[PDB]
Design a protein around this ligand. Structure first.
Ligand SMILES: N[C@@H](Cc1ccc(O)cc1)C(=O)O
Ligand SMILES: N[C@@H](Cc1ccc(O)cc1)C(=O)O
Lengths: 365, 365
């Protein structure tokens, strides 16, 4: 009854806070969120106009989301950089949505290229890991630290929440009529797999459509930025162009920027993170304690190159940048003792497995 | 309660009648249904092995269906040949399904290449025309004539009965994973429209998938033969190969031919009718009295070439073939008087607009 009143008031107050903060940033006194992500090295590139996205985040309490296909029994450190971004986003009052690809995983992302019983277990375990990684980001966040507010928004979703019932009709009418075949047949892996004679299924060919429709679904629900690994660039761009195509064809839409509104504030954007390598190829260190014990995880992060510990510290921890600047000189004193590698490992193992587990692994090694 | 008992008994009796009739045909004493359709010139070609389809129809009380996309405010004589087949099928105890393309028409069949308000009216009017064309086939049938039985089955469907809710997920999993992209990109109009730079939408590209899924939906419901115009050959073959692909990948399926069962009795088949021309191109004579009065329709069929009145009589009427053989000699007496053209016109105008209207138009002209 009157709860809509309280909630609406709170919303207004949040908007005020964001407008003041926006005056701070845009006048120069405070650093924008995108600039910060860059100084942490979590931004491999922006899908869309970079300054337009900085403008969006500064002017608007928007939402971010990253998706993982449960094609692994557990997460590994490779997935963490998008989530790091989400983490940051969350503790900065922006909405963070962790998405599990329940339906998309049954097809498999054909970039850059299984049984159900296994896949269901994978879904369950990763769902647990992200459910606890949320609260973990809250704890770890309020320690460095960020004051938890009522405006903070966190969400864990599984896309088959809507693919269990999403009509093919609606997808074809709303989105299918906007997408053009030629451009899609221009995609890299489509050219590759058609040239090789290996080919594809129609299901595989329609994967980026399904992912774009996840993006659209979350777009109607205040999520405007999609975050992913570098490899996902193509899928993210495709998403944006998809949503735009919808708006450009339903200009009367509840989400289309009707003049005189700034289009940069209504459009979708993307962020791609760097790619981690084991001095050779991509990434395998799990986050399931039963596959990678806390001692083994810690052990992995201890043995990080002296050349890399800076970027790694900026990307995999919440420690302030100045504390890193000083810690790196204090490390330069005697690099023999892994001064930085140890802070890194302890920080991350805490972020993943808890503070007690982290200090246990630390005292051990 | 006990109504399932009565119905099941009736079903058994029908199966008996069909088995006896099948002994008649296969021993030679009676003509098969496919052979009959051929002697009427309604069979331009068979999609699948012809003798296998003859075998199917002879051994099994299967179902037929033809689809029309409401992209015209009314039907025209061009649509009639598939329906003629259906008509025959119906009056022979086989199931006949007339399908309106409520959803497919919103996309438009891209072979061999609009607003909603109009399209809805089109749907309504064609729905009326087919609803009355069914009862019309019953009347006209029991006049030549065929004894109406309890086993006779007739149906009028609109595919958005299931596209209003059909999940994209189910289509992709069941069918999308079987379809291969390369072959589809080999389709004629896809090569044509990609070469020209005109291109397509994804919705257009997925049209034959939707139509194949209509075929699959009706396939689960005892309909095994799809009938269409010659132009629809590609769409029908694609349908068959689609259904087969489903069965070949779900061999445990309720509809897959598990040995030792004859696959020819479990597979889908197609029939394509000839194409009508106005001595130049395709077909425009409507069946709506408000667009083509009974006098105008009759007038069209009166002026048919003497060279063509035989095939036209075999295809557009239920008159027995011998009655045509004699009527064509009685016509050869004095071709000046349109002896055959008149029987043709009267017959068809009766089949479409009623007996009284037919005799009115006849006495007029
Ligand atoms: N494509 C991502 C998973 C994903 C699933 C759904 C999305 O909406 C986005 C991303 C991967 O393979 O890791
Ligand atoms: N393709 C047909 C219409 C149709 C629609 C649905 C079907 O399942 C079959 C046919 C036409 O254009 O005339």
């Amino acid at each position: 009854r009157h709860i809509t009143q309280q909630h609406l008031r709170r919303t207004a107050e949040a908007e005020e806070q964001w407008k003041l903060q926006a005056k701070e940033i845009e006048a120069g006194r405070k650093q924008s969120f995108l600039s910060f992500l860059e100084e942490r090295g979590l931004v491999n590139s922006v899908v869309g106009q970079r300054d337009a996205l900085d403008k969006l985040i500064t002017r608007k309490r928007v939402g971010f989301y990253a998706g993982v296909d449960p094609t692994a029994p557990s997460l590994h450190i490779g997935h963490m950089l998008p989530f790091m971004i989400l983490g940051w986003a969350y503790v900065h009052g922006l909405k963070a949505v962790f998405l599990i690809g329940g339906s998309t995983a049954k097809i498999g992302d054909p970039t850059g290229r299984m049984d159900g019983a296994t896949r269901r277990a994978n879904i369950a375990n990763i769902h647990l890991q992200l459910k606890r990684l949320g609260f973990s980001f809250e704890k770890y966040g309020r320690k460095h630290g960020f004051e938890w507010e009522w405006a903070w928004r966190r969400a864990l979703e599984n896309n088959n929440t809507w693919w269990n019932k999403q009509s093919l009709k609606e997808v074809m009418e709303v989105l299918g009529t906007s997408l053009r075949l030629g451009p899609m047949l221009g995609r890299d892996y489509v050219k590759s797999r058609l040239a090789s004679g290996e080919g594809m299924s129609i299901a595989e060919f329609c994967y980026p459509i399904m992912q774009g429709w996840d993006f659209w679904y979350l777009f109607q629900r205040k999520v405007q930025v999609q975050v992913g690994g570098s490899d996902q660039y193509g899928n993210i761009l495709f998403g944006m162009d998809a949503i735009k195509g919808i708006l450009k064809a339903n200009p009367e839409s509840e989400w289309a920027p009707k003049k005189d509104e700034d289009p940069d504030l209504a459009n979708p954007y993307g962020i791609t993170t760097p790619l981690l390598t084991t001095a050779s190829g991509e990434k395998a260190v799990w986050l399931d304690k039963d596959m990678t014990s806390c001692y083994d995880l810690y052990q992995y992060f201890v043995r990080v190159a002296d050349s890399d510990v800076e970027r790694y510290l900026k990307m995999f921890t919440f420690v302030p940048t100045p504390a890193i600047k000083e810690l790196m000189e204090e490390h330069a004193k005697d690099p023999s003792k892994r001064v930085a590698q140890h802070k890194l490992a302890r920080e991350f193992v805490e972020l993943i497995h808890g503070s007690l587990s982290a200090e246990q692994a630390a005292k051990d090694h």
